[PDB]
Amino acid sequence: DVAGAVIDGAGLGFDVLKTVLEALGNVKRKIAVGIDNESGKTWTAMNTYFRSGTSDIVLPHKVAHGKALLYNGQKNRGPVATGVVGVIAYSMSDGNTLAVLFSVPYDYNWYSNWWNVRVYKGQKRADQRMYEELYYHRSPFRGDNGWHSRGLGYGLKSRGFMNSSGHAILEIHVTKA
Ligand SMILES: CCCCCC(=O)OC[C@H](COP(=O)(O)OCC[N+](C)(C)C)OC(=O)CCCCC
């Protein structure tokens, strides 16, 4: 149960993500991310785009139906104080792309936690433009310590939870609609 790994989806919960979170050490801004694939189809990792921060971890390469991937990120170590803000992109075996946004900002005087989930038609890499769409234009969810559900189209739906703090967990379940 480490970041970079896949577990059984039914075992995804706050406990597993907290353990991933706690393993990163005392850093101001950091995130544990778990995405449970119940979509009926296998996911293959494309890439992650980091608008801010980074990860030492490889995206789990293959994530089968019934499995959850565990991932994490943290703020830049270097001289520029950043949050951790990015987009994970997975290829689904229908030819389409599952994209997940997380934003855990540095400066809470101006910003707060957000996340989003969207299915993109065809094969699309995570990048700056994708981040802008998901952050500014596709109705992202607040990290408000509550669950939010939404149809993704393609017969899939998402149910997800993100906490409100700079020590952030993001838990998402992708199911059949
Ligand atoms: C003029 C913008 C000031 C907003 C507060 C801030 O912390 O800037 C965001 C950024 C990093 O914060 P971050 O939370 O990662 O980005 C804002 C969150 N987003 C990108 C989602 C809007 O700060 C920097 O590193 C820019 C250079 C700072 C002085 C050298």
Ligand SMILES: CCCCCC(=O)OC[C@H](COP(=O)(O)OCC[N+](C)(C)C)OC(=O)CCCCC
């Ligand atoms: C000289 C104009 C000052 C405003 C700079 C700006 O438009 O940056 C917006 C950007 C918000 O970043 P982002 O979410 O990536 O969106 C910017 C890209 N656009 C404008 C296309 C949406 O704020 C930052 O955190 C960058 C740090 C600026 C301090 C040096």
Ligand SMILES: CCCCCC(=O)OC[C@H](COP(=O)(O)OCC[N+](C)(C)C)OC(=O)CCCCC
């Ligand atoms: C005295 C505190 C003022 C409170 C700030 C506020 O109302 O929200 C600020 C909003 C930040 O909100 P944003 O995350 O871009 O919008 C959240 C709504 N979504 C996620 C849909 C874009 O704009 C910025 O911070 C841009 C750069 C400021 C330069 C000083």
